[PDB]
Design a protein around this ligand. Structure first.
Ligand SMILES: NC(=O)c1ccc[n+]([C@@H]2O[C@H](COP(=O)([O-])OP(=O)(O)OC[C@H]3O[C@@H](n4cnc5c(N)ncnc54)[C@H](O)[C@@H]3O)[C@@H](O)[C@H]2O)c1
Ligand SMILES: NC(=O)c1ccc[n+]([C@@H]2O[C@H](COP(=O)([O-])OP(=O)(O)OC[C@H]3O[C@@H](n4cnc5c(N)ncnc54)[C@H](O)[C@@H]3O)[C@@H](O)[C@H]2O)c1
Ligand SMILES: NC(=O)c1ccc[n+]([C@@H]2O[C@H](COP(=O)([O-])OP(=O)(O)OC[C@H]3O[C@@H](n4cnc5c(N)ncnc54)[C@H](O)[C@@H]3O)[C@@H](O)[C@H]2O)c1
Ligand SMILES: NC(=O)c1ccc[n+]([C@@H]2O[C@H](COP(=O)([O-])OP(=O)(O)OC[C@H]3O[C@@H](n4cnc5c(N)ncnc54)[C@H](O)[C@@H]3O)[C@@H](O)[C@H]2O)c1
Lengths: 260, 260, 260, 260
């Protein structure tokens, strides 16, 4: 038996096999978890069904976190199939491209700010409410991904750095609120990894090349290592850890100035 | 001839004689600065006109930071009068009443999140964009107010924690964007202060009494030490300080666990 | 197999069955690890022989970290039995009772300060150096314990706060130095736990009680939960992690102010 | 008059006209402070009398911070002239050369650890204790200098980072220990400036080049910009500010990764 024998986990935000969430899906399944999966939109449905089956899963649901009623239904639809759940993994984030390309002051407009924070920060609080019942059942847990662009400035990150800072404070507030029920809320801050949201971004190459040089382990981290770190926080080995941001970035955050 | 002699400062967020905005206006004036002012809406037009008079000022303009026209217009209006400005002081913050009262997961709703972040965080960026031409002239600087509820959970603060965390990251993103022009960007993390944004609230009472016991100096902060600290971060004595979050809370944030 | 099958770990700082290093050992053996052990003075030896016998181990050595030869010695003595080690686990700390018993200014003399930083902080840098040859073979990994009394004031803790601050800086620096050799350095900020360090102290309970009231999971943490976190940080599941301070304190570090 | 109208201030650690101590003293004298100085060893005495002459001071005393006797005497010898005192500025920092030149794990020996901590971290505590009676009288304040080597890795800083972290904790433990006598205790974390610590070192030249590139204000900071921030923390404008590490580094600390 694996560490999560006969446990249930919903995984929000699986678009491709390069995803962080795919790396998280692998790891949990490896340790004998039973996965459910949400999809954002009808175009993604067939691919998420293929990914679901790859993890021996037939529990797929449409959930666009921009809509309230999709969040409510997607967990009311899950409540039919499962009478409880051990963890929900939030691995969602978005910003309009125009707010990510350039200098923060000019391109950061109201509507792009409003979306960044809605999808990337409020979805997690929305999802935490719509899960609270099925989580209370098994004293389950929450996991989200964040980026250190929130604590310190990173080129081009811009309005995401704010929406990610909102989300990390939001982790600590969910943790205190849901603590009394036995639910743990945690996040991982991942180093840069090549996925869909990095597709063809030219900054990303140089920026990964910089992260590789600056980091203490002299390499960029893998979706495998983010998967294993997530698993730990989704497991009973992390029962004393709530409210935590776990940096999985080779120790890049700890470096103030690199020799060359 | 005080420290700020023949300098100009727009002060955004004066609603009463209790306000941190008021305290800041007092000490900047007390050092010989030419203040301009803004007011949210028509109902607060007279009271601010009255508070404007007090500091030799007649440069009062309408600014609801919810609307994009009103932000840009009021920064043209001022550009007729002034051809330069040494500082802008953001001191605006709002969240709907039901978001600041209950269980975080239970009470915190999509629009309440949108609104809180929109007024309490994006307004700062929007004002920095609008204020950018004038500040370029004098190589001036920005200042906003934040609360350590972002960094560590406080009771009944909830989504404002998420909104302040977003604002504080914003301060750093601005610090880097506008730093090429000598424009500084800082914030003050004020202890709790009975100002207008706590009246009718019986929790805030208990909150000030706790703060007095935990704080090292064993006393709350009113608005004149927050005012004098804003004076400092707005003076040429802080020419080397940008992107800072200065804690004006008589040490509260350093205490891990206070005796009883 | 267990996760740590065919892996070797040294455990420095086993005093009693209340100890954290004791708890750590139980976790590591439970997943198939072959432990070594150390003892500081002659009076401890047989108790450490007996704890080592409980984990199927006759690798028990003298290592008083006050003495350089005794640190240099044991890692030559270990070098006979093992060609390569998968990690040292530093779990040593000390301060003269009189320094942890009163007002910080009144009681913090030069020798107290000297011992505190020598045993609790410096030692980790020495035992990193002594252990580096055996660590490079299997790309092993270090791990010390710390208390959040470094980052915020806890009453009585006093000089150990400055020692732990030094130690946590010790971690980030070693992590950069030894990263090049593939080595991971990490710490755990454990919540307060009743162990032989507190045995005689009245005020520690009132401190343990406070933690339970403030912490979001409303409970203290066990040497098991610390132990299980230390297993994860010593494994291939934490290969993407170095320089981290992982809080295992049921989320006490996230709360600025708790209901009552 | 200026801000510090007939206040008294002690300045430990003026080495030359390039020192921060000197630069602070200057800015403190500008606002009407009567200054007293100390010197370390018999060589520096004339130079420190020569400098103390520049600012109106014949109050100059011998104080090697390695020795307890000269601390208790220096504050007994000051107590003759001055009945009370308004602040003590601690600009003392020292580590061996060998410890600040190489790989961290190799060059850090027990004695170099003990010197770096004992001088750069304990000296600040020891002086606060001797200076209590005089400080208590005028409800005076303490200031110290630190480097963000404590919080993140800057190359070749090595064991000093452990001492600056140790120090930065002591600022908090002293802020809460001496807080009940209305004594404020703060530190300035200063950007890199060329001083007598930098003289002879060649890495320093390169480290300022990068710090200028990275820092949002595109410039290093001046002893006058550190002077005027110290002034603020030693003044009545900072009465709500204790236990603070104020960054005066052109916002370098706020940058995760600079473009280029
Ligand atoms: N890429 C990195 O190196 C990195 C580093 C740190 C943190 N992260 C975080 O990891 C998370 C996962 O991103 P990723 O790296 O796997 O990239 P990704 O683009 O594959 O993942 C983001 C996911 O968000 C989903 N999503 C977008 N809008 C949605 C909506 N309205 N409703 C529902 N789902 C929606 C997408 O379908 C997608 O699967 C993000 O929140 C990101 O900020 C990534
Ligand atoms: N009082 C505290 O405990 C404390 C501590 C730290 C920081 N802060 C923050 O400092 C700032 C100042 O608050 P305050 O203490 O002066 O209270 P306040 O109510 O006097 O000030 C808030 C200001 O925001 C303005 N405002 C609200 N909604 C607006 C809108 N739609 N458009 C434009 N202006 C709008 C109000 O007119 C008012 O002037 C806020 O951001 C607050 O959150 C408060
Ligand atoms: N228990 C807590 O509240 C707590 C919380 C966080 C961190 N910590 C830290 O974790 C570590 C483990 O503490 P513990 O709870 O296991 O206490 P413990 O007393 O059970 O273990 C401390 C160990 O340090 C050893 N030690 C003391 N002086 C030594 C010396 N000169 N040379 C070598 N070894 C020496 C002791 O003999 C013992 O084995 C310490 O560094 C402590 O500061 C403790
Ligand atoms: N300049 C920078 O780059 C920089 C940046 C951040 C922090 N700092 C810190 O600021 C402080 C001032 O450094 P500086 O730039 O003026 O260099 P400096 O060497 O000129 O000043 C340090 C002072 O410490 C004194 N000192 C050393 N050992 C002593 C002892 N045993 N007893 C008494 N006095 C002793 C010296 O006499 C000297 O005046 C130090 O703590 C330094 O670590 C410097």
């Amino acid at each position: 038996q694996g560490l999560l024998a006969g446990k249930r986990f919903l995984i929000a935000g699986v678009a491709s096999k390069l995803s962080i969430a795919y790396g998280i899906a692998q790891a949990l399944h490896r340790e004998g978890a039973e996965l459910a999966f949400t999809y954002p939109n009808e175009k993604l449905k067939k691919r998420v069904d293929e990914f679901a089956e790859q993890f021996g899963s037939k529990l797929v649901f449409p959930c666009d976190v921009a809509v309230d009623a999709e969040i409510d239904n997607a967990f009311a639809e899950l409540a039919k199939h499962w009478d409880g759940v051990d963890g929900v993994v939030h691995s969602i984030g978005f910003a309009p491209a125009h707010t990510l390309d350039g200098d923060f002051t000019d391109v950061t407009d109201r509507d792009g700010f409003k979306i960044a924070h809605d999808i990337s920060a409020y979805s997690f609080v929305a999802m935490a409410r719509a899960a609270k019942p099925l989580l209370q059942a098994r004293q389950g847990c929450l996991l989200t991904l964040t980026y250190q662009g929130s604590e310190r400035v990173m080129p081009n990150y811009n309005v995401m750095g704010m929406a990610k800072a909102s989300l990390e404070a939001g982790v600590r507030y969910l943790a205190s609120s849901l603590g009394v029920d036995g639910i743990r809320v945690n996040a991982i801050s991942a180093g840069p990894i090549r996925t869909l949201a990095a597709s063809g971004i030219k900054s990303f190459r140089k920026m990964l090349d910089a992260n590789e040089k600056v980091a203490p382990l002299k390499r960029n981290v893998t979706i495998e290592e983010v998967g294993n770190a997530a698993l730990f926080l989704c497991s009973p080995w992390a029962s004393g850890i709530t409210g935590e941001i776990l940096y999985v970035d080779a120790g890049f955050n700890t470096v103030g100035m690199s020799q060359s």
